[PDB]
């Protein structure tokens, strides 16, 4: 899960949902869990979850395809 030193996992649900996340100490980071997508917007509620970026290409292995 994403933790740039900006937000830790205290408080959230797990899941199957891998998306795309910016993280203040590495950057893009695809990732799945509803943890991912609430600590992110706790660490950066300002940042965009990146959903349809050319960056996200690795998304696309890194989430379960049909």
Known sequence: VPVGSDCEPKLCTMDLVPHCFL???????VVHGGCALSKYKCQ??????????HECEEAIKNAPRP
Do not use: A, D, F, W
Not at 23 to 29: A, D, Q, T
Not at 44 to 53: A, V, W
């Open 23 to 29: 993280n203040p100490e590495k950057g893009i980071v």
């Open 44 to 53: 950066n509620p300002n940042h965009e979850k990146l959903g349809y970026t």
